[PDB]
Structures are given as C-alpha cells and as structure tokens.
Design a binder for this molecule. Structure first.
Ligand SMILES: c1ccc2c(NCCCCCCCCSc3c4c(nc5ccccc35)CCCC4)c3c(nc2c1)CCCC3
Ligand SMILES: c1ccc2c(NCCCCCCCCSc3c4c(nc5ccccc35)CCCC4)c3c(nc2c1)CCCC3
Ligand SMILES: *[C@@H]1O[C@H](CO)[C@@H](O[C@@H]2O[C@H](CO)[C@@H](O)[C@H](O)[C@H]2NC(C)=O)[C@H](O)[C@H]1NC(C)=O
Ligand SMILES: *[C@@H]1O[C@H](CO)[C@@H](O)[C@H](O)[C@H]1NC(C)=O
Ligand SMILES: *[C@@H]1O[C@H](CO)[C@@H](O)[C@H](O)[C@H]1NC(C)=O
Ligand SMILES: *[C@H]1O[C@H](CO)[C@@H](O)[C@H](O)[C@H]1NC(C)=O
Ligand SMILES: *[C@H]1O[C@H](CO)[C@@H](O)[C@H](O)[C@H]1NC(C)=O
Lengths: 532, 532
C-alpha cells in the first residue's frame, strides 16, 4: 500500500488527504524520540525504541507544553499561533507529506516552527505542508521540539538539565529524516531545513553546531538568525534563570540535583505559570528559556564562530519582513492597542525605547532615541509609532540577520536575500502593524491557493512564486529556474549585497538592506555600550 | 564746517567722500585709546589722552599686527581679508561715516570685524561703511581691537597680561561712541553693535559681560556666537599657551613677570611667527589666542550665564551662512584644493573628521562619522566632501549659534533669525565651497549697489533689502517696516522657532534650523564625551 511505509524504527500507516482537487499521503505523528517524561524531563532526548506492528500515523500528535496566548480570545490573528491539539510532554513527533504516487528520490524540506523558544506547534493550519508538498513535488517534513523550561532550562555542568535539549530534539528529528526519509521517496542527501523566527534562529544554530552540520544539505532562514539578541544566553544567565525559576516554585536550592528534582515533580502548568518571572529586565522581545552558549552544542561564542568561518558552508536563502517589531509592541509596550491606530506620545516612545533595548544605559537609550527621532516633527504620533516599530524590528530581527548574512557570505557557497513587504488583503490585524512578523509563512505554505481563504489572484500568484523559489532552491541551491524567462533573483555578494523585494509587484533588486540603521545596531551601539 | 567736529577728546577733521553719485562725511582713524606699545603690550587699554588742535581724520589708520594669508598670492578671494594698510601695534582707532547733511540724532551701527581673534582690519574694502551709512541714513562706526597674542595672551592673576584686553579694546571704543557719537549726529541711546564670525562672537560676549551691557542698545550676530568652541578657553589653557609661546621664543619661564618681560622685548613678527605652535591639537577652526573665561569679563561659565539669564536683555538679529565650514577645510584638511572639485576619499573624510573634532575620543569620532555618512553610498566623493563641510559648519558655527539663540530667546525681548544661502554670481572661489563664511558681509555693506563690482540686479535688490532689514532693526528692534506690504520677517520664538532664508528668491519661512544635526552637537555628543 502507498500509505504503508517500513522504516528502520518500524512500520507506519499514513492517510490519503485531499489537496487542491487532488490527493497525497500524510504520515502524521511519527515518533522520533522516547517521551521526555518523568525523570527524562530536561534531559537530552533518547532515540525512539523501534516498535513492532504498524504505527497509526493518520492524525496529528500532541503539541508540547507551552504558554497559551489569551490576549484576544477567539481572534483568529492570535489563535492561529496557539496549540490546536492537546498539550503534553509526550510531544516529540514529526509529520510527513508525500506526493502521490510516492516519489523515488526527491527533494526534502524540513520545517522548524518558531515561537520564541517558549511556544510553537508543528500542527498549525498555517504549517499544513500538503500544498507545498503537492505543488512543488517535495517530501515536506515538519518536526517538533520541547520549548520553555522543558526544552531549555540550563544548569551547565549537570547531565540532568544540561540545556539546549530542545535543539537536540530538532537534531534527532533531522537524524531520523537522514536515516529514514529514503523510504518515503525522499533524498536524504538533498534535505533543506527551514524555519521562521526562533525556527530561523534554530536553522542558523544547526549551521553553526558541528554536531548538526552533516544532517542537512542547505538552509532557509525566515525572520531569524542564530545571533539574534533574544536567541541565546550565557551559561551563567541560564543558571541564574533556572535557580530563579526554582525560587518561584519554592524549591530547595542547595544543589542542582535538589533544584532539578523539585522542578521534575511540578506539573507542566506550574512551570508555565511562573516562566516569565525570571527575565532579568523589564523588556519586550526577550524570552526566558532559550539556547545557551555551552561550549558543546556551540563550541565557542557565536561571533567568534562566524568570524573564523567555523560553520557549515553551503547555500542559504533568508530574509525579513517589513514590520517585524509591531506584534511585540502591541503585546508589551504602553500606548499600543489592537483596535486603535496606536499613535504614540513622546513619553510612550521613550518608554518603548527602554523596553526595546533593556540592556542599555542612558547614553545608549539616548543614542537609539536620537537615531529614530525626526526632530523637525518629534510629537507626530504616527512617526513615533512607526519609529518604535522599526527600533524593535531592526534591533531584534533585521540587523542581526544582516550581520549574519554578511559574515556567512564570506565563507558560504551562495546567498539569496529577500525583503517581504506585502500586506495580505485578508489580514485581520490593524493597519498600523503593517507586514507582520510571521505573516510571510502563509505564502510560503501556499494558503493563498485555497479559494475559501479568499486572498487575491495576485496573492495566489505571489505564493506560487515564493513556493517555487523555496523548492527550487531546496532542490538546486538556486531559487531561479534554469534558462527561465522570469526576472532573476540575484546572488547576494559581500561586494554588491543585492536582495529582492517579495510582493505582488514586478521584482525589484536593491542593495545594502537597512544598512544605515544596521551600522548603528551592529557597529556603533555595541561599541558605545562597551566603552560606557 | 560739516567736516569739523568737536568731541570730548578734542577736535577732528573728516573728509568728504563720494558714494553712489553723492557724498558723505568720513572721519577715519580717530584714536580711542593710548597706543598699546612698549610696556603697555598685553595690558588693558588706557583711554586716549585728549589732544589740543585738530586731529586729521582723513585717512585710514594702521591695522593691528597680525598673521598675513599668503596661501593664494594675488587671489582676490583671500587678499580681500588681509590688512590693506601698514601694520602696527599703534592700531586702536575707529572710523565714522556720517550722512550729509549731518544728522541731529540718528541710529548708530558699530561694526566689529572677525578674523578668528588672530586677524582682522576695520579698513577692508568689504567693510566700507559709506554705502550703508548713505543708503540707510545711519551713523556707521567700525572699531578695531588687538588680535593674536597682542590682544589675547592670558596669564590669569597678573595685571600685566590679564587676557581679554582685545575685548576691552572693543569696549573702550564703545565707551567712546557712547560718550561722543552725539557730536556726529548719532543717538547714543540707539547704538547697535554688529559683527561677523569672531566679531559676532564678540557681540555676544558684550551681551554677556556686565561691564559692556550698558554701552549699546541692541545687537546683530553674523555667523558667530559667544559659545562657539573656538571663541574661548579656560584660564588654565590660556596660561599653558602663553607659557608655550614663551617656550617657542626661548623665554625665561620662571615667573609671569619673567615671561611677560621677555615677550615684550620681541618684535611683533617674532610672536606671529610662532603663534600657531601653541595649539594643543592637530585641528582646524581653532585659534591660539582667544578670549578667556576669567571670572571678570565673564563672571561665570558662558553656559551657566546663558542658563540663568545673566546677560543683557534686548532684541537681537542673527544668522548663519549655508556653507560656513568650507574655507577652513580648503586651508587645513587633506584632499581639499582651490582649483579642483575636491571630491574626498573615505580616508580623507576620516582624516577631516579627526581635525574637525580635535577634542574627541574614538567613540566620539565614530558618532560624528556615523551621523554624516550615507552608508548606501559611502565612497561618493561629493557626499564625503559636502559631509565634511557640514560637520565643520555645524560644529563650529551653526549649532553653537542655535544653542545661543534658543537660550537667549527665553529671556530676550525679540529674536530675528536668518539663513543666508545665496551664492554670489561674481564669486571667485570654487563652486564646491558654496555660500562661504563671510560672504554675506558684502551684501550687508551694500557692495552689490556698485555697478563696477558687477553683481546682478537681483543681488543689488537683495543687498538693499538686507541693508534695510539691518538698519530698520537697529533703529526699532524690528527689521520689518511698520505697515509694509512686503513679506514679514517673523519673530523667532522658543515655541515656533521660525527663521527666514536670505536670497534672491521670494522670502520663505522655515522652522527649527538644522535641528536634527544640532541636537547631535548640542545634546548627544557632549553627553557621550562626558560619559566616555
Ligand atoms: C511566529 C510564532 C508566533 C507568532 C505569534 N505568537 C504570539 C506571540 C506573542 C508575543 C508577546 C509575548 C506574549 C507572552 S508574555 C508572557 C507573560 C507571562 N508568561 C509567559 C510565559 C511564556 C511566554 C510569554 C509569557 C505571564 C506574565 C504576563 C506576560 C504572533 C505573531 N507571529 C508569530 C510568529 C504575530 C502577532 C500575533 C502573535
Ligand atoms: C571673516 C574673517 C576672515 C575670513 C577669511 N580669512 C582667512 C582665513 C584663513 C583660515 C585658515 C587658517 C589660516 C592660518 S593657519 C596659521 C599657520 C601658521 N601661523 C598662523 C598664525 C596665525 C593664524 C593662523 C596661522 C604657521 C603654521 C602654518 C599655519 C577667509 C574667509 N572668510 C573670512 C571671514 C573665506 C575664505 C577665505 C579666507
Ligand atoms: C519687550 O518688552 C516690552 C516691555 O518691556 C513688551 O511689551 C509689554 O508687553 C506686556 C505683555 O505683553 C504688556 O502688558 C505691556 O503693556 C507691554 N509694554 C509695552 C511698553 O509695550 C514686549 O512684549 C516685549 N517683546 C518681546 C518680544 O518680548
Ligand atoms: C488510528 O488508526 C485507526 C485505524 O487503525 C483509526 O481509528 C484512526 O485513523 C486513528 N485513531 C483515531 C484517533 O481515530
Ligand atoms: C592729513 O591731513 C592733511 C591736511 O591737513 C592732508 O595732507 C591729508 O588729508 C592727511 N595727510 C596725508 C596722509 O596726506
Ligand atoms: C472570506 O469569505 C467571506 C467573504 O467573501 C468571509 O465572510 C469569510 O470570513 C472569509 N473567509 C475566511 C477564511 O475567513
Ligand atoms: C566685472 O567687469 C568685467 C566683466 O564685465 C571683469 O573683467 C571685471 O574683472 C569685473 N569687475 C571686478 C570688480 O572684478
């Protein structure tokens, strides 16, 4: 049977799913690791023991335990990111969409979801891989990994809670794909890992980590890079937050063994209830439990690795959205609301700056403020609003990615950069939020092709073009169709630094993306904070 | 006789001079102080002992001893600023142009020449007061004062070389005008002091100094303000440069009396030959002997005086030119030449920045560099050239004046601000230099009215308009003609901060002159240098 596949871990039975008037095979909920439950909580994942019989892979698996957004109950804009399956620590599974008839050895794409390392699910409707798998004829895989304290509590030195285990979950899934995707018609030597936000950061981390490099061919990073200020902490900061977490649950803190033991007896929701109380500063765009520079997964600092070319050298395709920072301002900055234009006063602008660069002294705050203020019109609510939006997106997403791309390109084998600036016509979020963090995803997964979701014809065309770019890149290392009559997405070079816009208008090539602001964030500000 | 005037110091005989097909009286070379020669060198000026008989005031006096620009021998552009009379320490004289028939009690305007406090003459063709005196019917006075070490060598504590004596020369001339201008038909209660560059700074200094306030009614400052970074030094820096000057002339340095004595035996040219060797840094737009915050002429720091409103409160009219910094770059920055477009390389730009902000550390230099660099086109020679030009003008002239005007306006009784951006059609300097430091002067003195100088009709009209603004302001404290049909030059207020452009085009009102850059120079940079 086309729905029956014999893997090295055992037999699996998929289900035939309908897609754009056709069908394909879907193997949902395939286990790739032993449930990280009980004394296994916080531990490195263990490969799933092979099973006898046939594993029923007809339905989605549980989503990992995570904080649930209730800011706008029932609002689709936010609900679409929340777990749509029951939560459970028994959540290490992967899903596979396979073209029908089953391919023999085709391009494979593995999706890593974002969610600030504290949330995320591989089962979201917006991550449905059937459209992409079907349209581009690729074997699409979406993995899962532990988030929150469960995936990133770090107590360096102990083997019970070493940290980075969520990244190891990802790696194990990639190991499984490398070992078994061939049986699903996938070519293990042509696997592209791709993800957005924390998932984009993750992809970058697998590019850096020696232990992950050999498990994939190329990579795509969307609105995220390994060097993002929110993507990692030092072993010292990690330990401090772990201890503070224990302190929030009245844990004995005399030893790691003591702390770990206590944390393991707590119910999932007990950890989630206090998870945000460990942040060192009053901030936005900062998450409690994230990857840690432990000297193992990452041998040295990320910057020294990037400088010395200590990373996998292959081709990469990455980019950012126009208004990466709007969502976090909405959720955590005074003066921003979902149902108003959110014109910001000068006072709220200053408050916003303080929240956005939590690690800065007064001189630093003054530098940022000066950089983003039009002094000929400083009390303009729109300009103040948009200014804060840029500060957040530039500092947390765009500039970190630009630093990564420039460092990578020096040693890499091909870079393709994009700037997504199309505001979807059916967008439910307010206009002031613009082109939102994460809203390029629906185009990458081809949702616009579904009439019921009512996008415009132009948007359907954009999605098809984006899907073909992603899949062609995954297949060849070049998003451009060889001998095509279409406009060519140019390579990004250390010299020209070219990139393209991704929207419903005729492709346009630009250079030095957000260079003026990124020189400030990547060169000047750090030097300033270092000296002062 | 109309050319004979009996003053409290003695009788003076002027000469009838032709002007625009008419005539007026000119009393040139009137002494207002005893020659500051011999043991009087470096000393405070002494009032001129009254004389018996008639003083011949038919010809210009000698110019004070000063450095002479020989960079472009014969070039009118630079020669027009050099002494056009014989130099001598016996140079404390003033000139007076009087309408004919002699007025009874008319508006008086006293000109204070610039020249970085190290040079300058009241006899330059560009300072000929006959056009202004004739056209606007005012008694025009141009004074003189010691410059260089002669006027500003400062050894605080000693009464032989106290410092600021050049400013005291100016004050004595103003005292003379207050005491005798009535005999020339001038109204001593309606005297406006005006000057450009160091002369503009001087005007501001008389506004601040308690000992000068009562000697004039209102003021006009052109391309200069008291708080300019080059306009003054601390008593400590003043003493250091005095000692270093002595060290350059192999003087005994065991005591002030010793140093002073030695310096007094040197010929004028001996001091001038080493005058520039005492500057602490490799810089541009910095002069060796300038006013000193001694605690006498200026009771406290200039900034505290400005903050507390410790200054004369009256009306003021002031402004700057579009390209204040070009001249100094030409003379002291690598890559600039009179006969080329002076497109600057990135290296020369950096060299220029270092020379322009001599008192800054690396972080400071980086801040300036970042502020004036277009990172989307950093190797553009024109942009680099123009960028440096703005750095020099903004830092040394415009921003200091904007800080002064804003501080003054809080306590003042009326402020009128202008931005001169007309490039004269007969300008001999290269195009890249733009609207040059000091080139608004010829319009203020009405040279365009002289056909032989071949300006355009538009420029003649501009000059007449500027002359009428200056004289009307001097007469009433408002440059605007009451009940006029002409566009109104609006008051500058702390709230609106309005100003006008001064050129051959229809008057246009703007607000917050160079505010973006001045917030950098007046608020951010200082804070940065203070912290780091
Ligand atoms: C990728 C992945 C997720 C996306 C998405 N996720 C919702 C993001 C909400 C970010 C703002 C932080 C919200 C949680 S703050 C917080 C708190 C607490 N506990 C927490 C515990 C865990 C995480 C956050 C917690 C308790 C004290 C009160 C605050 C959203 C968007 N894009 C995404 C793209 C676009 C806007 C809608 C939300
Ligand atoms: C008001 C007053 C004067 C103006 C005017 N004066 C010429 C300004 C030249 C400025 C650059 C500094 C030139 C002297 S540097 C110098 C040196 C030395 N000694 C000096 C001694 C005194 C003063 C400067 C000295 C010896 C070592 C070599 C250098 C010029 C301009 N505007 C002016 C407006 C516009 C450009 C033409 C020159
Ligand atoms: C300059 O000062 C004069 C008075 O010293 C100001 O005029 C006075 O204004 C107040 C309030 O506006 C009136 O109550 C007085 O009757 C006015 N006195 C006279 C003699 O007019 C004038 O407003 C000030 N100008 C500026 C720009 O500050
Ligand atoms: C598991 O497979 C069975 C058929 O073997 C079928 O009921 C369904 O696809 C799965 N179970 C659930 C959740 O209904
Ligand atoms: C001084 O006045 C005399 C006439 O008294 C006349 O020669 C001339 O105006 C002046 N002297 C000079 C320099 O010729
Ligand atoms: C688009 O269809 C109708 C309007 O034509 C609208 O009511 C519906 O909510 C939209 N579909 C979705 C996916 O919300
Ligand atoms: C203007 O007149 C002629 C050209 O018409 C020119 O040669 C002369 O130099 C100019 N006059 C001046 C003041 O230089």
């Amino acid at each position: 049977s086309e729905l029956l596949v014999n893997t090295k871990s055992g037999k699996v039975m998929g289900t035939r799913v309908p897609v754009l008037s056709s069908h394909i095979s879907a193997f949902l909920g395939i286990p790739f690791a032993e449930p990280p439950v009980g004394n296994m909580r916080f531990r490195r994942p263990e490969p799933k023991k092979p099973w006898s019989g046939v594993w029923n892979a007809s339905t989605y698996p549980n989503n990992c335990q995570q904080y649930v957004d209730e800011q706008f109950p029932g609002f689709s804009g936010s609900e679409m990111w929340n777990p749509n399956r029951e939560m459970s620590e028994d959540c290490l599974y992967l899903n596979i969409w396979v073209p029908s008839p089953r391919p023999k050895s085709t391009t494979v794409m593995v999706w890593i979801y974002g969610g600030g390392f504290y949330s995320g699910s591989s089962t979201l409707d917006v991550y449905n891989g059937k459209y992409l798998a079907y349209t581009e004829e690729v074997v699409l895989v979406s993995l899962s990994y532990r988030v929150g304290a469960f995936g990133f509590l770090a107590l360096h030195g102990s083997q019970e809670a070493p940290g980075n285990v969520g990244l190891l979950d990802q790696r194990m899934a990639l190991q499984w794909v490398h070992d078994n995707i061939q049986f699903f018609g996938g070519d293990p030597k042509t696997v592209t890992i791709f993800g957005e936000s924390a998932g984009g950061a993750s992809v970058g981390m697998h590019i850096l980590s020696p232990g992950s490099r050999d498990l994939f061919r190329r990579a795509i990073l969307q609105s995220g890079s390994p060097n993002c200020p929110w993507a990692s902490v030092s072993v010292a900061e990690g330990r401090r937050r772990a201890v503070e977490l224990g302190r929030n649950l009245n844990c004995n803190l005399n030893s790691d063994e003591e702390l770990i033991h206590c944390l393991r007896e707590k119910k999932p929701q007990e950890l989630i209830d206090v998870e945000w109380n460990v942040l060192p500063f009053d901030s936005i765009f900062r998450f409690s439990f994230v990857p840690v520079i432990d000297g193992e997964f990452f041998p040295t600092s990320l910057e020294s690795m990037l400088n010395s070319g200590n990373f996998k050298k292959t081709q990469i395709l990455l980019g950012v959205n126009k208004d990466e920072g709007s969502f976090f301002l909405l959720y955590g900055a005074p003066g921003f609301s979902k149902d108003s234009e959110s014109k910001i006063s000068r006072e709220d602008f200053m408050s916003g700056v303080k929240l956005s660069v939590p690690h800065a002294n007064d001189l630093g705050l003054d530098a940022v403020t000066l950089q983003y203020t039009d002094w000929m019109d400083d009390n303009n609510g729109i300009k103040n609003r948009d200014g804060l939006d840029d500060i957040v997106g530039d500092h947390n997403v765009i500039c970190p990615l630009m630093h990564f791309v420039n460092k990578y390109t020096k040693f890499g084998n091909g870079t393709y950069l994009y700037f997504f600036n199309h505001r979807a016509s059916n967008l439910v979020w307010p206009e002031w939020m613009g082109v939102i963090h994460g809203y390029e995803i629906e185009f990458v997964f081809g949702l616009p092709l579904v009439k019921e979701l009512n996008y415009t014809a132009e948007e359907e065309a954009l999605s098809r073009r984006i899907m073909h770019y992603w899949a062609t890149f995954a297949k060849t290392g070049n998003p451009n169709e060889p001998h095509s009559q279409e406009s060519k997405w140019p390579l990004f070079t250390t010299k020209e630094q070219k990139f393209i816009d991704l929207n419903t208008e005729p492709m346009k090539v630009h250079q030095r993306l957000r260079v003026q602001m990124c020189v400030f964030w990547n060169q000047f500000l750090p030097k300033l904070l270092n000296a002062t």
